Each structure stands twice: as C-alpha cells, then as structure tokens.
Amino acid sequence: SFSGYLKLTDNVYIKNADIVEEAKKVKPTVVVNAANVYLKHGGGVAGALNKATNNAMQVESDDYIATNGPLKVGGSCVLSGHNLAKHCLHVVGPNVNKGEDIQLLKSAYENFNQHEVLLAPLLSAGIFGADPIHSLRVCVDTVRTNVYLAVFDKNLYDKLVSSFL
Numbered sequence: 001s002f003s004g005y006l007k008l009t010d011n012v013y014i015k016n017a018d019i020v021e022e023a024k025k026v027k028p029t030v031v032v033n034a035a036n037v038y039l040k041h042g043g044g045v046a047g048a049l050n051k052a053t054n055n056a057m058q059v060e061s062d063d064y065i066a067t068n069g070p071l072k073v074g075g076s077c078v079l080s081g082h083n084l085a086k087h088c089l090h091v092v093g094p095n096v097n098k099g100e101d102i103q104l105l106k107s108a109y110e111n112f113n114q115h116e117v118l119l120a121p122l123l124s125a126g127i128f129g130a131d132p133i134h135s136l137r138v139c140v141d142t143v144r145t146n147v148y149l150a151v152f153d154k155n156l157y158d159k160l161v162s163s164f165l
C-alpha cells in the first residue's frame with residue numbers, strides 16, 4: 001500500500017514524491033491526472049504520466065476526445081491507468097494562466113469523491129498557475145474520500161506542511 005505519507009486530516013495524506021514513481025511503486029486503483037479539457041498531456045503531471053505509459057495514455061485520450069468532445073473545466077473522465085494504475089481519473093482544474101475561474105477548483109476536487117482512494121497531485125498547482133497552498137486547502141475542505149497527495153517539489157512540500165492549518 002501507500003507508505004511514507006504524512007497525515008493532514010482524517011482522509012488527506014501528503015508525501016514529497018514524483019507521482020509517476022509513486023504510481024509505478026504502489027499501482028493504485030486510481031491515479032489522478034492534472035488534465036486539460038482536450039486531454040493533451042504535454043507537460044507537468046500529465047506529460048510525465050503520459051511519457052510513463054509510452055504515449056498509450058495520449059492515444060487512448062485522443063480516441064476519447066474524438067468520440068466525446070472536450071471535458072469541462074472542473075470536470076473529469078475515467079480512463080485506463082495503463083502501467084501506472086487500474087484507472088486514471090483525468091481531472092481538469094482551472095488553469096489560472098488561461099484566466100479560468102479559480103472557483104472551479106472546488107468542482108474539480110469534487111470528482112475525487114466518486115473514488116474510495118486515489119493517488120493525486122494538487123489540482124491547478126504547478127504549471128496551472130494557482131497557489132498550491134490554496135489548492136491543498138480546497139482539497140481538504142472538499143474531498144471526503146482517501147486522497148494521497150504526491151507533491152514533487154521538496155521546498156513546496158515543506159511550505160505546504162509547515163503552513164497547514
């Protein structure tokens with residue numbers, strides 16, 4: 001199972017870890033991807049998860065978009081986890097660098113409540129431009145299921161833990 005996580009609340013845990021390396025090690029039922037509406041996994045967590053699947057995640061995602069059209073900002077879809085997890089929950093948090101409504105971050109985290117346990121990144125953090133401290137706050141106040149957060153940056157991990165209310 002998950003190891004080396006710091007407990008933040010009854011259901012939220014956090015670790016300074018590369019989510020691809022965590023997924024390969026644990027092979028969770030659900031790994032969350034920090035997706036965009038087009039499921040174009042170019043950079044950040046999405047690019048790293050896709051590269052770990054040898055681009056199979058992108059091929060599957062392009063078929064999904066060809067059939068269904070784009071996701072909504074705040075929305076999600078369940079696809080295969082390939083070699084990383086049983087499933088990948090592609091969740092679209094607002095990209096504040098694209099002027100998307102940060103209030104949609106709570107809607108994005110609500111998708112996690114449809115799964116008993118997830119390995120996840122902080123939504124809208126990193127290249128999505130939101131304040132990661134705010135993202136962790138929204139996570140703990142929204143998600144009721146068991147979420148294991150993998151925060152790649154050590155310095156951000158320390159700041160998140162030391163400032164956690």
Ligand SMILES: Cc1c(NS(C)(=O)=O)c(=O)n(-c2ccccc2)n1C
Binds near residue numbers: 122127131
């Ligand atoms: C690598 C990285 C982030 N991704 S993460 C959540 O995997 O550590 C993240 O959110 N960043 C950041 C740090 C300070 C303030 C705002 C954002 N950094 C630099």
